[PDB]
């Protein structure tokens, strides 16, 4: 029922800082694996344990990386000190002897880690909601609203639509990935788009309320910030629009 749990889900931090990823395997399972995933190298095994005793650490880098299961229901992976090239999605996996024979490992939702050169490159997202075109409503008895999240870095964001204070998935579509605002620059800020289509009539109802919502994962409390700028912390930026008829 309860699968593998990993924490935290996102992790943006400056280089030279320690990062600690934790995982809780499925009850009973006596095998626990750690993987990393990147666009360049793919999904790679780092280490795996059997009854808390590590069996294979071939994929572990040098002593900068470190792992262990002090007990059978908790494992940890530590990077000290962190570095940009360690950025990746780290997955924890869990299994049993009999399942590994049929090759069944159960993976957790993962931890997205971004180690940056410095935090001054971090910006939260700007968010704007663009209202439907009258033509689209006349030409069709349907209205498509559009949301645009721009100027955010790194690309740790989750966008959602809310209709009358409730989250709606039916009639939604978000860009699978974000696109760089300036491909030229090695690094660059990102932009994401989404769209929500309701029935003309629903949009013309002066009571219905539509709000675009974007969760961003940035700095935390302990993260230093000595710059005259709204600290780019983990937060939610939003834009909105109300139903109208005319």
């Amino acid at each position: 029922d309860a699968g593998v749990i990993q924490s935290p889900r996102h992790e943006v931090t400056e280089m030279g800082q320690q990062v600690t990823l934790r995982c809780k395997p499925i009850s009973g399972h006596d095998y626990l694996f750690w993987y990393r995933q990147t666009m360049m190298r793919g999904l790679e095994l780092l280490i795996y344990f059997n009854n808390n005793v590590p069996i294979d650490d071939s994929g572990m880098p040098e002593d900068r990386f470190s792992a262990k299961m002090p007990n059978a229901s908790f494992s940890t992976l530590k990077i000290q000190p962190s570095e940009p090239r360690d950025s990746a999605v780290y997955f924890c996996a869990s299994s049993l002897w009999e399942k590994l024979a049929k090759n069944i490992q159960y993976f957790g939702a993962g931890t997205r880690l971004s180690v940056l050169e410095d935090l001054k490159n971090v910006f939260p997202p700007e968010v704007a909601v663009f209202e439907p075109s009258e033509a689209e409503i006349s030409h069709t008895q349907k209205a498509t609203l559009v949301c645009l999240a721009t100027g955010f870095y790194p690309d740790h964001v989750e966008l959602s639509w809310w209709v009358n204070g409730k989250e709606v998935h039916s009639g939604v579509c978000t860009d699978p990935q974000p696109l760089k605002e300036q491909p030229a620059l090695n690094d660059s800020r990102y932009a994401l788009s989404s769209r929500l289509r309701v029935s003309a009539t629903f949009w013309q109802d002066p009571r219905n309320h539509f709000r675009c919502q974007v969760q961003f994962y940035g700095l935390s409390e302990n993260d230093e910030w000595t710059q005259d700028r709204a600290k780019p912390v983990t937060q939610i930026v939003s834009a909105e629009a109300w139903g109208r008829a005319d």
């Binding site: 793919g42 997955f91 993976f107 033509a135 788009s193």
Partner: protein, 199 residues
């Protein structure tokens, strides 16, 4: 301990048969299984097979050929829900350590029954300044290319589903702060059907 797999991404139309495959060089690999990974999710087992043979589960058929050191996954009658990255994982008997392939992205395009290609202008809410052009209701047999310059931003096609009415459609977005930028010549660099409008 290395396996080859073309990353794609292959794009096929709903209902098309798709073939994914990996190749390897180490004969020690004796177990093979395909995992499926949905965007921003963890890999989940899909199929698995031992030695040479072909396991068939519904619309999926997995094969392995130790002589050719070649493994394949066939998906017939591809469905939108099949859009994901498929990773072949293999291992030997001397360890439960799995070796994965880079994985192949598969985008199976929804079959939209009634196309109505059109491009609209959406106004900024409250107060913002940057035209925002919507290209919608076009068929999945249409590709949206990137704009020549970078001041004009464009997002690939995206399908939404209004389950309440058994209706779905596509849409690509283009916006810019540039003055000369206007809908009508917003998608020029894309091969779009005959339909277009203007207020």
């Amino acid at each position: 301990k290395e396996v080859e797999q073309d990353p794609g991404p292959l794009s096929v139309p709903e209902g098309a048969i798709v073939s994914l495959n990996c190749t390897y060089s180490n004969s020690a690999f004796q177990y093979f299984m395909w995992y499926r990974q949905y965007s921003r999710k963890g890999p989940e087992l899909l199929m698995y097979t031992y030695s040479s043979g072909n396991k068939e589960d519904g619309r999926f058929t997995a094969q392995v050929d130790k002589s050719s050191k070649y493994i394949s996954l066939f998906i017939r009658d591809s469905q939108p829900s099949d859009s994901a990255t498929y990773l072949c994982a293999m291992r030997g008997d001397s360890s439960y350590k799995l070796i994965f392939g880079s994985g192949t992205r598969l985008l199976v395009r929804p079959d939209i029954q009634n196309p109505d290609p059109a491009v609209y202008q959406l106004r900024d809410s409250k107060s913002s300044d940057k035209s925002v052009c919507l290209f919608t209701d076009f068929d999945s047999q249409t590709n949206v290319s990137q704009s020549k310059d970078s001041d004009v931003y464009i997002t690939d096609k995206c399908v939404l589903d209004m389950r309440s009415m058994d209706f779905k459609s596509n849409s690509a977005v283009a916006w810019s702060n540039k003055s000369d930028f206007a809908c009508a010549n917003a998608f020029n660099n894309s091969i779009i059907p005959e339909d277009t409008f203007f207020p």
